[PDB]
Design a protein around this nucleic acid. Structure first.
Lengths: 125, 38, 213, 230, 34, 219, 102, 67, 102, 63, 51
RNA sequence: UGACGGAGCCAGCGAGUCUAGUGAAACUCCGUCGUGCUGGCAACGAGGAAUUCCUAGUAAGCGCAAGUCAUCAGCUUGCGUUGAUUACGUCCCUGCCCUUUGUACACAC
């Protein structure tokens, strides 16, 4: 019944599903808040989808992320990818396309690996 | 008693000179087998 | 005069976010402490090789810099310092330990010399990197050296190498750790005191090049 | 107006090694030493000019180049010099076969020759020699090149006979407060004084006469003692 | 010090080997809408 | 003649070979793998560590490599090699028994790297023709007729002796010299898909435990 | 809101709300004499009877930040500048005080 | 003449500007002997035009009426 | 195939070895090499123009090569294909370098 | 000693230089028209600046 | 500088082992090496004549 | 880069009525110590000369499973976790190879 949006963030074998919907503004990773995501030195790697665009985008929506697999740093990279492209997809579908591609421009100017992973490797020289 | 399979051959001077003068004969008469270009 | 309103309600979230964390949406600082603006590279020819113009939050950009030739000239120089810090057989792979001791050494660089530690480490790079060197012109192995110049990417490479391995040998079996020896090394290399391993090694390389020029 | 030290009782000087690249010192490098070992069948020896007629000619080399006596009598002179007792010197040697040996200041090199020969056999084959009191390790084969072990601020000169002659006292007070001095002296019987071209920026000499090896060492040491007030 | 803003202290350490500290100290949303 | 999954590019195109080790190899296996990549030409070596075999196979067969040689060891001494031909082709996997390598023995100089000549001795059965085709379509087609290195795959009772020789042709005969690794390899399995799955249909694999095992060759 | 008490061979920081020792500095070799905080309250200098000024950071006794080796005589008073931050004045039983840039 | 056409554009690019100036002196002397000017016209044209086309920025900043 | 627009002659014809149909091409600035991509082959075919031979077949796309273009200044090849990937090939001078941008 | 800065305008190719050392052609920054041939040690490309302790010396080959 | 005397054995031989001053631990090390080489040679020979 | 003592946490392989699934370690945090070897007068404190291998999820660190007709358990093969430095130029040295009519159709050389 609610406007909701589901995205995916992947690094090596971690995978994070982020559901974004309209709400009061709560960002929850694995049930716990976002301010508990260990190893606590990469908590700003998790935070930078919020601090790159401002918390006034997150003031009206609530995100929840479920992260399985991987290790510590692969899980924080999956979390930040899921949060970033979930915010982009929510502003695409339920807010205007101008804020959509402003968010895409800001995340892509920081690093496009917030939005597109580096996936299939190696190179056979 | 009995055993499953013939064990691995211990390489001797006579068998190495056997395949050695075999390939002497072979590369003398140049009757070897490679690929050919298409 | 003229002022723009662009938020129209004080932004409050349901998950409480710390005040310094939500203060970090106006400027990106390294570890939320050290600002990247007014951090210039005070020696030209090394600007465009020591990169301080995209600010980061932690020295763990997992981007790929080793698949084109001069692509590591735009890895941020804090992260190049971190990656060069995590090398020997004992400490291979341990980038989180390297990031944590880089955080500790920037804190104690600032508490000793009360100035910007990113500016201190950038000055240390641009003072450490040797501006001349010798190759061994062979002649089959005739032991004679000929002085060559040295490109700025090699100067930044050898600067980070000299600083980090000087911090290792200075922390080898003394009371100080790698963070404190690296802090002393970066401070002395920034001011250029000739008490550091790194710029003593630079002065030796440049003097040998001046000798068999 | 200036006070005394708080403790007048004389401490021993800190013995310096390659693990201290900070302190100003004097490195003396005995280059092209003749330290090779050989088998008899049952027995191992160090190659002399005198333990054989033609073991060296069976090995190909000539007998005039198998002289460990002169690096022995240089090592005695350097380690009985007062600068070694004061702790401002360490002695590196490098064999003509390219083997670098670090020599501690704390070592007591044996005074006769064949005791030193039996010491050099075990050093060359066990790569390490401990003390009788077995607490530290005081004669050891280390890894080439020597510039990995020399101090980071260190002027490296070499000694010869055909060079602009200097005086050691004013030459050493020319250099500054943290610069050491690495003096490559050749421990050959004869040869061209080019054994260390790739490490050295200054090739100097001490006399106008053909100077023996340990006499050149003792001349440079006594000049250093006068320059550093020892 | 001058800006103590809390529990304020006078401390004196003696030559006897001890330390003396003397301090001076310092319903419903429906009902509320009604 | 050339069989049904090699006939499209038999002599049209040069091969492209990857040579790679098992997982975290020992130093003698790395020396051995360098010897295999400069045994046969247009082969390069790839450092397998933390490579999954499905995405390794997929990266090879979309980069365009023809085939893969995976080497397995036992405390230095290499024990197996698997040859996987990539355009959904066959894998012949072999065990290696008497391995003597030049990096172990002697600095006898450098090798020759010419497109070599190839000798195949008494591969009489149809399985012999199959293993001849899979062993010689990892070599370069059409060498010069005065190429001075030859290699030999000689069957000696299901134990393929593998050697490499250089030669000149003198006035009274031909004088031979031994370069590179000698083996006796033996096929323990063929199957018809690539290395990724092991769900592929088996064309041949040796039956060790049947009671008529040691009565015949290429059983 | 905290104060450092210099007893013999240890310096204890007490809190001004519980009056118990929150933190303590015990790795001195002889009698520690003076212990003062910097004007920013971020680090703590302590002069010791062997003439070794050791400055730690406050609220972390395990990270000795630098050990100035002053005179061989006992150093009896060590305090940072009250205006400047990076200079430390140590007087000792050598009848000479020293200003050190840290 | 004896340098080859594949490495001629490298042979003319290696040489510095002092050698370019004396190359111009060489061309200036050689087009007075009109025998070996006319037997090497396209070679002189190719080399001279590549030389000043490559070194054009420095040549037009030289200040000497002799040149 | 190549066309002289002076003598109006088709002087060169380049085919592959696989009997595919070509959908896009790209030439060198210094026109030594022509390059062409198909929509059924996933390879890029690299022909010399001076001789007529097939100089290379660049492989690495996992989808039909939709478009080719040579950079006019530094002469790097850019191909882009339906596997959602643009790819940059350094062909000239010992590199054989591939950079895939997803 | 006063030092000078010089931007690479051309990495010289097919010179017979010793490996690990590449000849290069640099123009100055105080007068951006005059060049000099130097030969550098690390990896170098065009329009990057390198630091000359002297500029009174043209570079020969190394070999 | 203090002056220590160097510990070394006279008439050194690397191929012989060091002279341990205990005749019941040097002996067990000698006979452990002896059983290892003779056991290895013995079972190598019996498995190759089994082959 | 230690040693004690607590705590938080993160994988992917693997399921025969057969065996005699939950969970990893490195990591992260919080208290405590404090850096001159071994015996019933032996070795040893990161290993000489030489030598081998190596270019991105690569070197290296880390654990967990399996045990697939050959091989392997004095171990072998998988699987994930963490993850760099330096080349990415050059034929100067060492070698190996190719060509020496341009042929293939213009233009140009």
């Amino acid at each position: 019944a609610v406007p909701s949006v589901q995205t995916f963030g992947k690094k090596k074998s971690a995978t994070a599903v982020a559901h974004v919907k309209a709400g009061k503004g709560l960002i929850k990773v694995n049930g716990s808040p976002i301010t508990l995501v260990e190893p606590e030195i990469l908590r700003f790697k998790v935070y930078e989808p919020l601090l790159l665009v401002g918390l006034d985008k997150f003031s009206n929506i609530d995100i929840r992320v479920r992260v399985t697999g991987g290790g510590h740093v692969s899980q924080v990279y999956a979390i930040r990818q899921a949060i970033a492209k979930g915010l982009v997809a929510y502003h695409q579908k339920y807010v205007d396309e101008q804020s959509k591609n402003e968010l895409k421009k800001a995340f892509t100017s920081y690093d496009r690996t917030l939005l597109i992973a580096d996936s299939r490797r190696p190179e056979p020289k | 008693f009995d055993r499953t399979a013939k064990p691995v051959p211990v390489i001797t001077s006579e068998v190495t000179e056997s395949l050695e003068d075999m390939i002497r004969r072979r590369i003398q008469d140049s009757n070897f087998d490679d690929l050919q270009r298409r | 005069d003229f002022e723009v309103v662009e938020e129209f309600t004080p932004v409050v979230l349901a998950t409480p976010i710390p005040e310094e964390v939500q203060q970090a949406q106006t400027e990106i600082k390294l570890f939320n402490k050290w600002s990247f603006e007014e951090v210039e590279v005070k020696d030209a020819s090394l600007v465009d090789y020591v990169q301080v113009r995209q600010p980061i939050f932690v020295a763990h950009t997992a981007g790929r810099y080793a698949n084109k030739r001069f692509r590591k000239a735009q890895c941020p120089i804090i992260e190049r310092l971190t990656n060069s810090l995590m090398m020997n057989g004992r400490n291979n792979g341990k980038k989180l330990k390297a990031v944590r001791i880089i955080k500790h050494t920037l804190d104690i660089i600032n508490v000793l010399t009360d100035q910007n530690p990113i500016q201190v480490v950038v000055d240390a790079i641009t003072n450490t990197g040797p501006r001349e060197d010798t190759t061994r012109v062979g002649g089959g192995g005739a032991a004679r050296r000929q002085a060559v110049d040295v490109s700025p990417l090699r100067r930044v490479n050898q600067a980070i190498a000299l600083l980090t391995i000087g911090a290792r040998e200075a922390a080898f079996r003394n009371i100080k750790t790698i963070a404190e020896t690296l802090a002393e090394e970066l401070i002395n290399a920034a001011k250029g005191s000739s008490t550091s391993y790194a710029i003593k090694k630079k002065d030796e390389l440049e003097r040998v090049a001046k000798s068999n020029r | 107006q200036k006070a005394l030290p708080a403790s007048l009782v004389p401490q021993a000087p800190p013995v310096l090694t390659s693990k201290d690249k900070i302190t100003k010192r004097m490195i003396v490098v005995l280059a092209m030493a003749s330290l090779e070992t050989h088998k008899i069948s049952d027995k191992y020896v160090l190659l002399n000019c005198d333990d054989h007629q033609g073991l060296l000619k069976k090995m190909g080399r000539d007998i005039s180049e198998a002289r460990p006596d002169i690096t022995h009598q240089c090592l005695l002179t350097l380690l009985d010099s007062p600068i070694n007792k004061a702790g401002k010197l360490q002695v590196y040697i490098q064999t003509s076969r390219g083997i670098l040996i670090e020599v501690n200041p704390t070592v007591r090199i044996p005074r006769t020759f064949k005791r030193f020969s039996g010491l050099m056999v075990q050093l060359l084959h066990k790569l390490s020699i401990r003390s009788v009191n077995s607490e530290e390790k005081l004669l050891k084969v280390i890894k080439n090149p020597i510039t990995d072990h020399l101090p980071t601020k260190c002027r490296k000169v070499t000694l010869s006979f055909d060079a602009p002659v200097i005086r050691v006292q004013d030459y050493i007070e020319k250099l500054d407060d943290d610069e050491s001095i690495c003096v490559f002296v050749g421990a050959m019987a004869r040869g061209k004084d080019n054994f260390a071209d790739e490490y050295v920026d200054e090739k100097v000499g001490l006399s106008n006469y053909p100077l023996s090896a340990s006499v050149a060492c003792s001349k440079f040491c006594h000049g250093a003692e006068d320059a550093w007030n020892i | 010090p001058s800006t103590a803003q809390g529990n304020r202290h006078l401390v004196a350490g003696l030559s006897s080997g001890l330390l003396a500290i003397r301090t001076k100290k310092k319903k419903s949303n429906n009902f509320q809408r009604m | 003649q050339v069989d049904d999954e090699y006939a499209a590019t038999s002599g049209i195109m040069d091969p492209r070979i990857i040579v790679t080790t098992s997982r975290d190899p020992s130093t003698r296996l790395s020396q051995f793998a360098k010897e295999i990549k400069l045994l046969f030409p247009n082969a390069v070596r790839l450092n397998r560590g933390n490579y999954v075999m499905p995405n390794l196979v997929d990266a090879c067969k979309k980069s365009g490599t023809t085939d893969l040689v995976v080497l397995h060891e036992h405390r230095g001494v290499p024990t197996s090699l698997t040859i996987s031909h990539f355009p959904h082709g066959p894998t012949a996997q072999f065990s290696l028994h008497n391995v003597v390598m030049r990096h172990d023995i002697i600095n006898a100089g450098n090798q020759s790297e010419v497109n070599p000549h190839l000798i195949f001795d008494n591969f009489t059965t149809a399985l012999g023709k199959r293993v001849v085709c899979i062993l010689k379509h990892l070599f370069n087609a059409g060498p010069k007729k005065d190429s001075e290195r030859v290699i030999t795959f000689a069957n000696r009772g299901d134990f393929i002796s593998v050697r490499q020789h250089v030669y000149v042709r003198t006035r009274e005969g031909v004088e031979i010299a031994e370069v590179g690794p000698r083996f006796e390899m033996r096929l323990f399995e063929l199957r018809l898909g690539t290395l990724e799955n092991k769900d592929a249909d088996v064309e041949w694999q040796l039956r060790r435990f049947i009671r008529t095992a040691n009565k015949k060759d290429y059983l | 809101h905290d104060f450092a008490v210099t007893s013999s061979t240890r310096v204890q920081i007490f809190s001004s709300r519980t009056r118990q020792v929150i933190k303590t500095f015990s790795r001195f070799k002889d009698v520690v004499y003076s212990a003062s905080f910097r004007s920013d309250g971020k680090l703590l200098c302590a002069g010791d009877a062997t003439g070794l000024v050791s400055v730690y950071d406050s609220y972390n006794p395990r990270t000795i930040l630098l050990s100035i080796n002053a005179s061989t005589h006992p150093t009896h008073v060590t305090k940072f500048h009250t205006q400047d931050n990076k200079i430390l004045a140590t007087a000792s039983d050598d009848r000479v005080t020293r200003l050190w840039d840290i | 003449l004896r340098i080859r056409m594949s490495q001629l554009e490298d042979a003319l690019m290696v040489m510095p500007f002092s050698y370019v100036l004396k190359f111009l002196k060489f061309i200036d002397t050689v087009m007075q002997n009109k025998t070996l000017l006319h037997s090497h016209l396209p070679l002189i044209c190719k080399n001279l035009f590549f030389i000043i086309k490559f070194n054009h920025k420095e040549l037009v900043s030289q200040k000497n009426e002799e040149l | 195939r190549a066309w002289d627009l002076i003598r109006y002659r088709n002087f060169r014809t380049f085919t592959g070895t696989e009997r595919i149909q070509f959908n896009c091409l790209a030439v060198d600035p210094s026109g030594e090499v022509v390059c062409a991509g198909s929509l059924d082959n996933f390879d890029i075919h690299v022909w010399s123009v001076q001789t007529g031979q097939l100089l290379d077949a660049l492989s690495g796309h996992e989808g039909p090569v939709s478009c080719l273009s040579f950079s006019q200044e530094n002469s790097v090849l850019a191909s882009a294909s339906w596997d959602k990937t643009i790819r940059i090939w350094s062909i000239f001078g010992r590199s054989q370098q591939v950079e895939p941008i997803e | 000693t006063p030092v000078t800065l010089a931007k690479v305008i051309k990495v010289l190719g097919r010179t017979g230089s010793r490996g690990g050392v590449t000849q290069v052609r640099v123009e100055f920054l105080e007068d951006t028209s005059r060049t000099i041939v130097r030969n550098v040690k690390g990896p170098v490309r065009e329009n990057d600046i390198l630091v000359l302790m002297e500029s009174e010396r043209e570079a020969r080959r190394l070999r | 500088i203090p002056t220590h005397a160097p510990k070394y054995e006279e008439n050194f031989n690397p191929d012989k082992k060091s002279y341990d001053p205990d005749r019941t631990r040097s002996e067990i090390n000698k006979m452990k090496a002896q059983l290892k080489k003779e056991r290895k040679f013995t079972m190598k020979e019996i498995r190759k004549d089994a082959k």
